[PDB]
Amino acid sequence: KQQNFCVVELLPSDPEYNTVASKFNQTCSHFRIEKIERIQNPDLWNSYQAKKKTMDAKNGQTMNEKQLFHGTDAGSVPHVNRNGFNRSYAGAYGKGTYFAVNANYSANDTYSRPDANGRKHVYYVRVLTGIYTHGNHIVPPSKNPQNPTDLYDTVTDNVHHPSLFVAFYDYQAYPEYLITFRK
Numbered sequence: 609k610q611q612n613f614c615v616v617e618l619l620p621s622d623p624e625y626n627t628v629a630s631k632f633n634q635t636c637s638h639f640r641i642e643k644i645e646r647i648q649n650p651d652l653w654n655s656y657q658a659k660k661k662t663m664d665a666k667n668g669q670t671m672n673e674k675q676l677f678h679g680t681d682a683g684s685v686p687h688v689n690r691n692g693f694n695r696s697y698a699g700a701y702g703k704g705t706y707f708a709v710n711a712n713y714s715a716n717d718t719y720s721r722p723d724a725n726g727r728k729h730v731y732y733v734r735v736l737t738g739i740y741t742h743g744n745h746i747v748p749p750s751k752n753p754q755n756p757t758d759l760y761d762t763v764t765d766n767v768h769h770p771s772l773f774v775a776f777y778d779y780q781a782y783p784e785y786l787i788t789f790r791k
């Protein structure tokens with residue numbers, strides 16, 4: 609299972625396109641979008657769905673999935689397209705992977721670092737946030753001290769008004785779209 613992938617450009621025409629643009633535009637309408645691409649990685653996608661199938665049947669009425677933003681340098685884009693956000697990724701709440709509710713956070717040059725042509729990249733990612741608590745600065749805390757292998761799926765900065773989520777597990781996030789844009 610080598611998780612090869614294709615990149616398909618999203619046509620302005622595509623219903624999909626407008627949904628990503630709108631959500632991006634809530635907090636980043638001052639940036640100019642060059643393009644939006646869909647990342648098609650069947651092995652990565654299947655393994656993502658496997659964890660979701662598990663997580664749904666486990667968390668009852670909880671909506672496990674959210675769509676969050678993650679900014680990264682150009683160099684990491686191939687890495688992320690193949691391996692999502694699993695383990696071997698160089699790009700005070702955790703040692704997992706951070707994801708932003710609002711594009712503007714991710715659009716910081718420190719995450720969405722401009723390349724030579726001045727182009728910034730932010731993914732719009734399906735993340736399985738599941739059941740979360742407030743996090744502190746490598747594995748999530750345990751839900752129940754009397755049953756402590758049962759863990760929070762993610763942690764967040766504020767539980768009832770969250771602006772970021774941290775994932776620590778494998779196949780917990782799928783990089784469905786990439787948004788390329790400039791200042």
Ligand SMILES: NC(=O)c1cccc(NC(=O)/C=C/C(=O)O)c1
Nearest residue numbers: 677678679706707708714719772
């Ligand atoms: N990659 C992002 O878009 C993003 C979004 C929200 C938060 C962060 N990262 C952090 O706040 C801290 C990352 C780290 O300490 O490695 C990145």
